[PDB]
Design a binder for this molecule. Structure first.
Ligand code: CHL
Ligand code: CHL
Ligand code: CHL
Ligand code: CLA
Ligand code: CLA
Ligand code: CLA
Ligand code: CLA
Ligand code: CLA
Ligand SMILES: CC1=C[C@H](O)CC(C)(C)[C@H]1/C=C/C(C)=C/C=C/C(C)=C/C=C/C=C(C)/C=C/C=C(C)/C=C/C1=C(C)C[C@H](O)CC1(C)C
Ligand SMILES: CC1=C[C@H](O)CC(C)(C)[C@H]1/C=C/C(C)=C/C=C/C(C)=C/C=C/C=C(C)/C=C/C=C(C)/C=C/C1=C(C)C[C@H](O)CC1(C)C
Ligand SMILES: CCCCCCCCCCCCC/C=C\[C@H](O)[C@H](N)CO
Lengths: 210, 213, 229, 217
């Protein structure tokens, strides 16, 4: 109900999306963000899932891209879904326990700062080290931004972050779908589609297996 | 004033000509009460609409059967479809009962409380289930052409045409059942037999209708 | 005022304002304002589609007399696969029809170019975009609009006739015209069939029931062949 | 007003301000079992207990059954887990059921006494100092203290919605267990197996094809 960009020009978008949240396009046909508290929680959930999917898509695409060139290292020919049954320096259970404890610590710190902004901006060991007073949930800053990149156009940068996060989330969902249907790595499907795009489509692949 | 089913006989008080196709035909006074007449009006409209769909389908299938198209008769189409296509009969019955149950239940509770279905409890749709009159559910879903919301005289004329065509289709379906039980063939086969010889191929010569013949 | 029946009273909902208004509406489908507004766009889209299709069929037969238009979707080979062509066509057609539909329900809302903010369609009516869609307009606007709706109605009836003649005789429009001009007293539909109370004969459907397109057996039946006279 | 039947006459007893305060009020009472306010309160407690018990049971049946289909676990069927669990156990089923009945009777007796008199379990000098924490909140069937350790019931704005996710889900669980029983007496296999068999051919594998749920067909 404003002049901000929309996902459907002319459509009557809901009134609870006023543009305050980053990447607001008024897309909510199910009206899941009607409740202000639910929307406040969904914003943080979307941001965390976005950054995690960004790291996931980057960690899926970079090793396969580096394996196809002269660059070599121990785990190169292994697929992203086949990395679990790999011979490491430690069993997966021990690593799972270690990461669960570390993630529990950082996630509890983030949750504490989420229920009360600025309540967790102090380093527990060194009292001198701290985060700036001006902070919002989901945007830590301080040591998390050592180069001061947020000091510039934060709105455009936040829009870039949310858009890249949505794109990465869709890409990861596509990775799962392609792995469950084709049963091959994503870059292989990309090259297969690039060789002949007219006969390498989702409709053709699914019709052949029907 | 208006024509009646029996000329010279005064029309009853519960039939004043306000409803479509009102000819004052009620010798048993089954619709003397207002609520009972309302229920019977909706029942007659539903019966006529189903009879119209049935008569049209039976006539079209018999047309395809008379010409070399391989269409089965209406009294064998169920067996032909269930045996030709791998379709489970009880499953189809349950699906049909589910869809008809939902539609008829919404219609029934709308009859009990007019305009209640327009509250928006069904996917947010409101004006599509508001209803116009008894047995005439106007809206963008049932009447997307908007013929019930324009040119009142044309609407009343169409209402009269609908009730008359429905009664004719009900009589047609009864005739289909009697023709199949007496002659054993389809309605168009009976029509061709009658057109081939109308003086000797009729109900007075089938040997079943008139037992003393 | 021109009408579809000289000396006849036109319906009350038709006052001769819209282009091509000749007071023809026995069913009164245009009595409602919203229904008429939607049907106007539908008729315009139908007119343009039928005109393009008739011109395509005529040029296809004149340039290629050995390729049947009814078989045009069957005997045409292209490096682009049928599934890829269908995907491209579905996406492009979906995009343009969504833009047109949004302009119908919300006028002056999708007239802006999304890639470039400097391009924008000028204010217009519904069903008549204009601007970039109308670079040259030789003649009067209302006169050309009437000519467009009349040519569209003729093209719609022409496409229906094309389909029926291709299903009954199996020949294209030019071939059917030449065959009809050769023996006009015996090549009309009245000569091909007749119905009486004792007999009902219809011309055979020249189109095969099934078409083997890459081993799929696409059914190609004659439109309401059982109801053929 | 949300209703279980658009147009149906909502009962007067379900339209009172106290009855509408309950979570999941959809005006469903064709038998009028909630006309009496005391009976309605008791049945509300019964529905809450059934919802939580059904949710825990259906979860303990569905999750290990879903993990058994994959390679995560090897838990047997719910209708056969009792025999397998009692085979290589440390006590027979009778002794275990006796200890169970004792332990469950104590807490159910305390819950019954709190239902009869709200907050009565906080009698001084009766539970070695833990009696203070045994007093529930203002609403019956929603206690605090030892229960709810995360303290998610302190935020009222979501409280009214939280309860809606507890009753509704529980109601679904109550039907789920019912299906688990009916399917057991209709197909002879587990719930996950019935779901997979139905997904394989939904148009020919359902309750209208087993011959048990439709004997006239
Ligand atoms: C978002 C995280 C995540 C995702 C999507 C996957 C996905 C997958 N992991 Mg996996 N993993 C993930 C985290 C982790 N894994 C492991 C350790 C392993 C191992 C050791 C293995 C996998 C395997 C697998 C595959 C089969 C999963 C399975 O056995 O399912 C069954 C469980 C359910 C259906 C529930 C695959 C689809 C397996 C593989 O490589 O298969 C080819 C395998 O052997 N993962 C650890 C511990 C460090 C993880 C996280 O901490
Ligand atoms: C609505 C009226 C209706 C009527 C008059 C008939 C009449 C008939 N159906 Mg039938 N059906 C009807 C509805 C339906 N049928 C079927 C599905 C079938 C099948 C699958 C078969 C028939 C068959 C038959 C015939 C054998 C008798 C029978 O089963 O009667 C039941 C109907 C009535 C007793 C009348 C009900 C009230 C009017 C018969 C001429 C059989 C057939 O054609 O054999 C050659 C056959 O195999 N019907 C469905 C879908 C599930 C229907 C409605 O939903
Ligand atoms: C002398 C008889 C006597 C009886 C019949 C009871 C009975 C009861 N006391 Mg008890 N008490 C008795 C004396 C005393 N109580 C207490 C202190 C308490 C406390 C602190 C509590 C009870 C509670 C209970 C109930 C527990 C139900 C239960 O566990 O069922 C299951 C059955 C068993 C565990 C054993 C059954 C054995 C046998 C009878 C079974 C064969 C049939 C129950 C109705 C509880 C309650 O409900 O409070 C509201 C509770 O919290 N009593 C004291 C000390 C002050 C007592 C002193 O004499
Ligand atoms: C949160 C996202 C994410 C996750 C869950 C993983 C998870 C994993 N990565 Mg990965 N990675 C990521 C992002 C991610 N990565 C990104 C963004 C990059 C680009 C810099 C990489 C680049 C990368 C490389 C080059 C390799 C992995 C490898 C691995 C696997 C072993 C971990 C390891 O190397 O020990 C920890 C490493 C250090 C402590 C140093 C493991 C399953 C290894 C692999 O290929 O798997 C077989 C491996 O060689 N990753
Ligand atoms: C391209 C996606 C993207 C973008 C545009 C942003 C943008 C932003 N982030 Mg962010 N972030 C991302 C991904 C992204 N992030 C991911 C995946 C994570 C998980 C590790 C984080 C976690 C994170 C935290 C914890 C914080 C930010 C913050 C910020 C803001 C500060 C400016 C900045 O970070 O420098 C600009 C960013 C870039 C120029 C991207 C550089 C690309 C690198 C080199 C890719 C690495 C190689 C690749 C993996 C292969 C800014 C709006 C801070 C903030 O909110 O300030 C208050 C904050 O504290 N981000
Ligand atoms: C980041 C989005 C993205 C991208 C770039 C791709 C790309 C590709 N997919 Mg894929 N996919 C996606 C998401 C995506 N997918 C999602 C969300 C799902 C559902 C889980 C799938 C499920 C899927 C299956 C089952 C298959 C593919 C296949 C393919 C490959 C070729 C055929 C094809 O395009 O089918 C069509 C792709 C779709 C219908 C996905 C929906 C549209 C997505 C969201 C893209 C939207 C366009 C958007 C503007 C971004 C454009 C790209 C941009 C980066 C420039 C191709 C390289 C096929 C393959 O592996 O080839 C052998 C295959 O069979 N995809
Ligand atoms: C591929 C399945 C299929 C097949 C093989 C047939 C075959 C036949 N139909 Mg039929 N039809 C079908 C599907 C099919 N139909 C569907 C789904 C509908 C509902 C829209 C109809 C509605 C229909 C009617 C109303 C009539 C026929 C008639 C006929 C016969 C005359 C030829 C004709 O089709 O006229 C063409 C009629 C059409 C409606 C053309 C559309 C049909 C094509 C195959 C599109 C359907 C695709 C669908 C989504 C799957 C013929 C044997 C006529 C008849 O019975 O003769 C007396 C007749 O009047 N059909
Ligand atoms: C009130 C609900 C309920 C009931 C009556 C049962 C009953 C049963 N379960 Mg089950 N379970 C439930 C809920 C329930 N479960 C839930 C919610 C889950 C998580 C989804 C599970 C997950 C589960 C698994 C994985 C297994 C069982 C098994 C069993 C059977 C063996 C008895 C047993 O576990 O020893 C008694 C257990 C204890 C006395 C608990 C001891 C402490 C445990 C080990 C730590 C858990 C602590 C945590 C806070 C609770 C038994 C019939 C086992 C089986 O299939 O038998 C062959 C089996 O492997 N259950
Ligand atoms: C008015 C009155 C009153 C007074 O007082 C008294 C008296 C006199 C008694 C009266 C009268 C009455 C009457 C006449 C009644 C009747 C009715 C009817 C007939 C109905 C039907 C009705 C009818 C109907 C519905 C019908 C329907 C049908 C259908 C659906 C069909 C279907 C089908 C088809 C398509 C085909 C296939 O293959 C088969 C089937 C499936 C089968
Ligand atoms: C409302 C109303 C009122 C009106 O007025 C009328 C009417 C209509 C009547 C109504 C209705 C009603 C109903 C429906 C009811 C139902 C209920 C239920 C179902 C419950 C369950 C409920 C259920 C439940 C609890 C359940 C539970 C469960 C459990 C524990 C389980 C357990 C187990 C497990 C884990 C596993 C193993 O291996 C086995 C076992 C051991 C087995
Ligand atoms: C990918 C999931 C897409 C949705 C899948 C089907 C979900 C069906 C939900 C349809 C929503 C029905 C009600 C919609 C709008 C309501 O009128 C408003 N929320 C009421 O204010």
């Amino acid at each position: 109900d404003a002049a901000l960009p929309s996902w459907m020009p002319g459509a009557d978008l809901p009134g609870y999306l006023n543009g305050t949240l980053p990447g607001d396009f008024g897309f909510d046909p199910l009206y899941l963000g009607q409740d202000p508290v639910k929307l406040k929680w969904y914003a943080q959930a979307e941001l965390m899932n976005a950054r995690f999917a960004m790291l996931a898509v980057a960690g899926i695409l970079v090793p396969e891209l580096l394996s196809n060139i002269g660059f070599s290292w121990p785990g190169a020919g292994v697929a992203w879904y086949d990395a679990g049954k790999f011979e490491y320096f430690a069993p997966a259970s021990s690593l799972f326990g270690v990461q669960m404890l570390l993630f529990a610590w950082v996630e509890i710190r983030r949750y504490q700062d989420f229920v009360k902004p600025g309540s967790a901006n102090q380093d527990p060991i060194f009292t001198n080290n701290k985060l700036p007073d001006g902070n919002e949930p989901g945007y830590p800053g301080g040591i998390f931004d050592p180069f001061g990149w947020s000091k510039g156009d934060i709105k455009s940068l936040k829009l870039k972050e949310i858009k890249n996060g949505r794109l990465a989330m869709l890409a990861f969902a596509g990775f799962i779908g392609q792995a469950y249907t084709t049963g091959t790595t994503p870059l292989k499907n990309l090259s297969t589609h690039l060789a002949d795009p007219w006969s390498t489509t989702v409709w053709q692949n699914d019709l052949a297996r029907l | 004033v208006r024509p009646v089913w029996f000329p010279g006989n005064p029309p009853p008080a519960h039939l004043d000509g306000s409803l479509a196709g009102d000819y004052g035909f009620d010798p048993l006074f089954l619709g003397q009460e207002p609520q009972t007449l309302k229920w019977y009006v909706q029942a007659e409209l539903v019966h006529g609409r189903f009879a119209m769909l049935g008569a049209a389908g039976i006539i079209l299938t018999s047309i395809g059967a008379k010409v070399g198209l391989g269409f089965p008769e209406w009294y064998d189409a169920g067996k032909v479809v269930v045996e030709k296509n791998n379709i489970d009969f009880p499953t189809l019955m349950v699906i049909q009962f589910y869809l008809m149950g939902w539609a008829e239940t919404k219609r029934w509770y709308d009859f009990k409380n007019p305009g209640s279905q327009a509250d928006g409890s069904f996917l947010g749709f409101t004006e599509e289930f508001k209803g116009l009159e008894n047995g005439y559910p106007g809206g963008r879903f049932f009447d997307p052409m908007g013929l019930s919301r324009g040119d009142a005289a044309k609407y009343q004329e169409y209402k009269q045409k609908e009730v008359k065509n429905g009664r004719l289709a009900m009589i047609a379906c009864l005739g289909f059942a009697a023709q199949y039980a007496a002659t054993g063939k389809g309605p168009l086969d009976n029509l061709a037999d009658h057109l081939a010889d109308p003086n000797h191929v009729n109900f007075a010569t089938n040997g079943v209708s008139i037992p003393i013949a | 005022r021109p009408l579809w029946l000289p000396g006849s009273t036109p319906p009350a909902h038709l006052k001769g304002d819209l282009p091509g208004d000749f007071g023809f509406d026995p069913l009164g489908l245009g009595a409602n304002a919203e229904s008429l507004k939607w049907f106007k766009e539908s008729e315009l889209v139908h007119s343009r589609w039928a005109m393009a299709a008739v011109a395509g069929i005529l040029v296809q037969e004149i340039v290629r007399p050995d390729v049947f238009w009814y078989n045009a979707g069957k005997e045409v080979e292209s490096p682009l696969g049928p599934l890829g062509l269908l995907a491209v066509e579905f996406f492009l057609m979906h995009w343009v029809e969504v833009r047109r539909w949004q302009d119908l329900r919300k006028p002056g809302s999708v007239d802006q170019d999304p890639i470039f903010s400097q391009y924008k369609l000028p204010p217009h009516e519904v069903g008549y975009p204009g601007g970039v869609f109308a670079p040259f307009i030789p003649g009067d606007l209302a006169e050309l609009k009437v000519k467009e709706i009349k040519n569209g109605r003729l093209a719609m009836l022409a496409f229906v006739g094309f389909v029926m003649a291709a299903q009954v005789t199996g020949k294209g429009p030019i071939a059917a015209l030449q065959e009809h001009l050769a023996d006009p007293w015996g090549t009309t539909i009245f000569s091909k069939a007749a119905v009486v109370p004792g007999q009902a004969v219809a011309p055979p459907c020249k189109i095969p029931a099934s078409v083997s397109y890459k081993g799929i057996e696409i059914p190609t039946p004659c439109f309401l062949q059982g109801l053929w006279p | 007003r949300q209703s279980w039947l658009p147009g149906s006459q909502i009962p007067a007893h379900l339209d009172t301000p106290a009855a509408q305060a309950l979570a999941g009020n959809f005006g469903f009472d064709p038998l009028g079992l909630g006309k009496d306010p005391v009976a309605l309160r008791w049945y509300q407690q019964a529905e809450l207990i059934h919802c939580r018990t059904a949710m825990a049971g259906v979860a303990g049946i569905l999750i290990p059954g879903l993990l058994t289909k994959a390679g995560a676990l090897n838990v047997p069927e719910w209708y056969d887990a009792g025999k397998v669990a009692i085979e290589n156990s440390f006590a027979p089923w009778g002794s275990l059921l006796a200890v169970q009945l004792f332990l469950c009777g104590f807490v159910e007796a305390k819950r019954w006494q709190d239902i009869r008199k709200p907050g009565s379990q906080g009698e001084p000098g009766s539970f070695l100092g833990f009696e203070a924490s045994l007093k529930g909140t203002s609403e019956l069937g929603y206690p605090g203290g030892p229960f709810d350790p995360l303290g998610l019931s302190k935020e009222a704005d979501k409280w009214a919605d939280w309860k809606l996710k507890e009753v509704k889900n529980g109601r679904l669980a109550m039907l789920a267990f019912l299906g688990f029983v009916a399917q057991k007496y209709a197909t002879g296999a587990g719930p996950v197996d019935n779901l997979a068999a139905h997904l394989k051919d939904p148009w020919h594998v359902n309750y209208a094809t087993n011959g048990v749920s439709l004997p006239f067909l």
